[PDB]
Each structure stands twice: as structure tokens, then as C-alpha cells.
Design a protein around this ligand. Sequence first.
Ligand code: HEM
Ligand SMILES: O=C(CC(c1ccccc1)c1ccccc1)Cn1ccnc1
Length: 214
Amino acid sequence: PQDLSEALKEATKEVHTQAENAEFMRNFQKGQVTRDGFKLVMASLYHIYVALEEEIERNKESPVFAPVYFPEELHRKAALEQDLAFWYGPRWQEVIPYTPAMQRYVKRLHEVGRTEPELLVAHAYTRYLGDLSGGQVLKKIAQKALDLPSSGEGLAFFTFPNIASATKFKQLYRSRMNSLEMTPAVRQRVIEEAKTAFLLNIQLFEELQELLTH
Ligand code: HEM
Ligand SMILES: O=C(CC(c1ccccc1)c1ccccc1)Cn1ccnc1
């Protein structure tokens, strides 16, 4: 496919199905989630977005990422910090878990950030465009299963307040990915790193399930 947006969607089909048939998400679809499990997800998303956004800020000026840079529209660190404060208490930053599977993901983002930033779009595509697609339904499932209090906190991550229409922004975000100047050789590594990105996610759900069910 000529468009990067199409080429990434085409390449990741087998790895996305592999991620749908992850043991954790197999249960999540049927609404078989616990508070413990959700907390782990929420903590995972924190460590990943902290690293992703840290590396994005390093490379916002660079032509390899500048077009897809949407700080205000997409930033998730603060939303997640608000949630972890509710899930783990005001001393969340001292008590939240940092598992090896999380560490691998975080290590990759920091390596891609410093040594090959032209691939950072692959992770940005995976994380943002991924979490922008599923959030609405995944919240509806979580909300039903967890039966949390009327405290008005803890699910802030699932709302992108500076994005009016998710569908229109995804359109826009795809256009900006299509406008990225890159040799058909880097084009290869972006697709390969996107595959790597999915692998790290599935690998995470596997370590999470090994922890939750003893
Ligand atoms: C419960 C497990 C999952 C299900 C049922 C699922 C299914 C879906 C659905 C229904 C969409 C909406 C399609 C759209 O309107 O664009 C989507 C999009 C997407 N998902 Fe998932 N998914 C799951 C897990 C994952 C994981 C673990 C990742 C990797 C981080 C991922 C990455 C993506 C991406 C990048 C898109 C946007 C595709 C595009 O438009 O280019 N998904 N998926
Ligand atoms: O699956 C998605 C987010 C998912 C998740 C969590 C941690 C790491 C990677 C993914 C998650 C978020 C919040 C609660 C339960 C699960 C986005 N998605 C939906 C459809 N296609 C992509």
C-alpha cells in the first residue's frame, strides 16, 4: 500500500488478532476483569506513556516526527496520574508496580527515542491511534464490571478532552502519517517497529495474567 497509514494496518493484521486472543483481553471482552487487573493495566499505561511522551518531547522539532506531533490533543500522562492517584492513593508514585514486561516496553521506547527517532511514529501510531479507537467501549465494560463509587475519578484516561470527534482526528492523524518523508527502506523499519510494538503489548498481557492468576 502507498500510504503509511494503510501499510501499517495491513502489516499488523496477524499481530492484532494475536492481541485480541490474549488471555487477559479474552476475559476483558466478556467483562471478567478485577480491580487488581485494572490497576495493573492503569499502572502499565502510566509507565509506557511517561516514556513515550518523554521521547516525543525530545523529538518534536525533528522532521521525522514533527507532522504527527499533537501535544494538547493526545497527552495522556496527566490523565493517568489523576487516575493512579485514585486507584493507588496519594502516594501512588511510591507504591505502583514496575514489572519486567513493563520495563522492556519502557526500555524500547527510550532506545527508539535516542538512537532511531524515525521509528517513534510506529509506537505513536500503536499507542495513540489504538487507545483512541477502543477507549469508549472499554470504559463501558470496565465501568460495569468494577462498580466503582460515584467519586468522579479513575477513568479520566478514556476521555480525550481536546478531541471533539475521534473519527475526524484519526482521519487527520492518518493524513499526517502519510505526509512523512521517508525512504522505502525506513518505511520497512517503521512497519517492523510497529510489529515490535504489538509484540511488547501482547507480551505484557501475558505477564499480567501470570501475575493475576498466581
Ligand atoms: C480486547 C482486545 C482488542 C480488540 C477487541 C481490538 C479491536 C479493535 C477495534 C474494534 C478497533 C476499531 C477499528 C477502528 O474503528 O479504527 C481497533 C483498532 C485498532 N487497534 Fe485494536 N483491539 C484490541 C487490542 C489491541 C491492542 C493490544 C493493540 C496494540 C496496542 C491494538 C491496536 C490497534 C490499533 C493501532 C487500531 C487502529 C487501526 C487503524 O485504524 O489503523 N488493539 N482494534
Ligand atoms: O486495547 C486497548 C487498550 C488496552 C491496553 C492496556 C494496556 C496496554 C495496551 C492496551 C486497555 C486499556 C484500558 C483498559 C483495558 C485495556 C486499546 N484498543 C482497543 C481496541 N483496539 C485498541
